Amino acid sequence: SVSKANVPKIDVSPLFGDDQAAKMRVAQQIDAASRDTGFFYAVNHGINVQRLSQKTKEFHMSITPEEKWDLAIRAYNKEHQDQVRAGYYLSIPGKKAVESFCYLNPNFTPDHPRIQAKTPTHEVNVWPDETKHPGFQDFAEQYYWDVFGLSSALLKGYALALGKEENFFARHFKPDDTLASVVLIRYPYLDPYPEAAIKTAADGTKLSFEWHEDVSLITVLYQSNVQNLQVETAAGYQDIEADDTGYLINCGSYMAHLTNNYYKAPIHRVKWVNAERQSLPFFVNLGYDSVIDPFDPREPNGKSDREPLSYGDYLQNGLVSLINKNGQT
Numbered sequence: 150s151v152s153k154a155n156v157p158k159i160d161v162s163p164l165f166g167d168d169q170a171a172k173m174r175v176a177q178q179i180d181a182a183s184r185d186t187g188f189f190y191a192v193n194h195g196i197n198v199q200r201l202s203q204k205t206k207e208f209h210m211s212i213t214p215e216e217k218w219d220l221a222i223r224a225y226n227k228e229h230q231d232q233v234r235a236g237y238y239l240s241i242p243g244k245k246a247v248e249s250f251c252y253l254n255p256n257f258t259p260d261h262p263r264i265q266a267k268t269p270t271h272e273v274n275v276w277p278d279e280t281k282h283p284g285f286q287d288f289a290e291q292y293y294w295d296v297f298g299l300s301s302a303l304l305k306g307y308a309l310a311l312g313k314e315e316n317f318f319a320r321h322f323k324p325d326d327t328l329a330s331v332v333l334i335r336y337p338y339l340d341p342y343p344e345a346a347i348k349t350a351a352d353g354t355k356l357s358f359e360w361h362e363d364v365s366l367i368t369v370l371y372q373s374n375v376q377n378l379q380v381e382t383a384a385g386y387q388d389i390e391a392d393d394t395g396y397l398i399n400c401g402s403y404m405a406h407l408t409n410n411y412y413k414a415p416i417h418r419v420k421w422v423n424a425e426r427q428s429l430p431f432f433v434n435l436g437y438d439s440v441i442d443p444f445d446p447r448e449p450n451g452k453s454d455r456e457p458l459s460y461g462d463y464l465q466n467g468l469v470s471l472i473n474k475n476g477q478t
């Protein structure tokens with residue numbers, strides 16, 4: 150048997166308010182979680198996740214093969230050279246089970262200065278036809294702002310946990326420029342399930358996605374109630390229990406860099422499960438030019454022997470590296 154990872158449920162509601170002592174007590178919880186397995190569930194987050202799951206299902210189950218080509222990223226459709234990040238990520242029956250749809254900041258419009266300048270990692274979102282998916286685009290853009298709000302509150306908690314003022318990260322996380330993404334992932338039930346879409350870990354576990362650290366500052370993740378994630382600890386890989394009422398939070402490798410690995414980016418992997426399910430991450434990314442000066446909360450003077458890294462450089466290279474390591478999703 151596999152042991153259960155310690156993933157505490159933290160009521161994050163004080164991070165939306167003005168009770169500073171209560172926010173400090175949340176921050177302590179975040180600190181403890183981040184120093185232990187690296188994961189926690191945010192509860193009392195205020196987001197309607199049941200509705201998110203329903204609207205996402207309505208999309209995944211009604212989009213057609215024609216629409217998927219028309220929305221496909223460059224990796225699947227050579228005609229779409231501008232779509233590196235945003236669009237549809239196709240399955241390959243008999244070979245690849247997963248499929249997904251990614252979108253970015255809704256404020257990246259054709260007139261946005263970074264779109265005009267053609268700065269890497271910024272793209273204008275692509276959407277299906279409104280008549281075929283009524284309400285979907287509006288729902289998805291409002292969800293971006295709902296989970297942006299939750300993420301801003303969680304960043305106040307991380308900042309306080311590290312001994313900083315509450316806007317230490319959130320001042321870099323702004324609606325006009327954030328590189329944050331939503332990915333609506335469909336993991337399907339398949340009968341038969343093709344062995345080619347199943348990877349095997351060194352310890353024999355059947356996987357859908359191999360070990361990795363997240364390319365993010367933090368990751369704010371909703372998933373269906375099907376257990377699938379595992380975290381590497383000093384005691385081996387342990388199962389993260391599902392909670393389809395909460396958001397699963399962890400740090401990405403930008404947080405590890407900034408904190409000199411005091412808050413590690415936990416290594417985790419996705420087990421293969423033959424079940425129809427959803428995995429809906431929001432990757433909390435800063436702006437392209439955002440630079441946080443690294444520090445070390447374990448050293449008396451707080452200094453670190455790491456160099457500042459702009460977020461845009463981090464993200465463009467991190468996303469390419471993750472594809473190289475674990476495959477195009």
Ligand SMILES: [Fe+3]
Nearest residue numbers: 361362363417
């Ligand atoms: Fe991950």
